[PDB]
């Protein structure tokens, strides 16, 4: 473990291995000496820009809220010894052996494995959508996996509750409507991501590896087809976007069965139901669990629907004046000691 990584946590803890390092979070495995339990500890420095604190607060409340086999389990949050000396948040959670990205890049999955992995992903998404929560950042590296093949979603900082400078979700998994029209968060965007994830499981590489906005759209449409009609161009309302779409080559829907010659026809079927342009026609998470491809694991009675979360659960996001770092520090402290 890199000498540069420093965790201001109880000395009963002993860092083991560094599992993830990013500008937002740093994840290390660690042993809690007295119990011998090995856990995962995510460290976040949230007080340099409200933006970081906000993410942190959202990730925390979400984790504490759910108790689902497919959503990573939070054991606790390190308690600072003083408000004055509170500069990092340490989320202690269940240790997993890896993420799906690592699995795709080093393992040949049978069709069984894919069926099961995507099934769990969808199941997690259902409970989220049913509580009116959307992840917004679903991708293979945020799906944790154990050797028995259990899968759990992690990274809830970009989540939002549905209603009537920022961290951006990787574009290879962004739905075309988000990239175009001024998108009011929807359940369909997450399904689009799952769709990219399933495709990646079949392809063993990302299906839409765009280098930028333009290229990204050029790749997506090259697969699902260029939308032409106005009924088709409805969902999009911003003129420049209509115009941009019209200046694109007119691609037909690419024949997937010919793309994935050895992929299960049922898998491709489900795939095509997720990667659809019009978010309103895109299959829902529940529906997807009901699809024939997941028949081996589907069970209408063991697929939690969740319960609605109101918009004020993330109240701190809807203030006239933005909250200060101190206001946010309080809010996080409140979640840690509750």
């Amino acid at each position: 473990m890199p000498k540069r990584i420093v965790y201001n946590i109880s000395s009963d803890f002993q860092l083991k291995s560094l599992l993830g390092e990013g500008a937002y979070g740093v994840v290390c495995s660690a042993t809690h000496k007295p119990t011998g339990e090995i856990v995962a500890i995510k460290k976040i420095e949230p007080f340099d820009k409200p933006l970081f604190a906000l993410r942190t607060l959202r990730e925390i409340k979400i984790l504490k809220h759910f108790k689902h086999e497919n959503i990573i389990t939070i054991f606790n949050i390190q308690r600072p010894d003083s408000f004055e000396n509170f500069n990092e948040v340490y989320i202690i959670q269940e240790l997993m052996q890896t993420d799906l990205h690592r699995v795709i890049s080093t393992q040949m999955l049978s069709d069984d494995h894919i069926q099961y992995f995507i099934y769990q992903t969808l199941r997690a998404v259902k409970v989220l959508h049913g509580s009116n929560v959307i992840h917004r950042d679903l991708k293979p590296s945020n799906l944790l996996i154990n050797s028995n093949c259990d899968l759990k979603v992690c990274d809830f900082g970009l989540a939002r509750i549905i209603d009537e400078v920022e961290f951006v979700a990787t574009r290879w998994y962004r739905a075309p409507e988000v990239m175009l029209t001024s998108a009011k968060y929807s359940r369909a965007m997450d399904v689009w991501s799952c769709g990219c994830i399933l495709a990646e499981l079949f392809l063993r590489r990302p299906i839409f590896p765009g280098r930028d906005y333009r290229h990204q759209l050029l790749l997506i449409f090259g697969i699902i087809g260029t939308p032409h009609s106005d009924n088709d161009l409805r969902c999009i309302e911003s003129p420049r976007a209509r115009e941009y779409i019209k200046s694109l080559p007119m691609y037909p829907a690419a024949p997937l069965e010919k793309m994935f010659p050895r992929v299960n026809p049922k898998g491709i079927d489900l795939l095509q139901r997720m990667l659809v342009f019009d978010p309103a026609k895109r299959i829902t998470a529940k529906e997807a669990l009901e699809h024939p491809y997941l028949q081996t694991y589907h069970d209408p009675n063991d697929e939690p629907e969740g319960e609605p979360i109101p918009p004020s659960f993330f109240e701190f996001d809807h203030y006239k004046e933005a909250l200060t770092t101190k206001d946010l520090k309080k809010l996080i402290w409140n979640e840690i000691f509750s």
Binding site: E69, N70, I145, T296
Partner: peptide
């Protein structure tokens, strides 16, 4: 955990 649903005992050597 959802192991009770892993009807086929799927594994991964990690």
């Amino acid at each position: 955990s959802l192991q009770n649903r892993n009807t086929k005992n799927l594994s991964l050597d990690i």
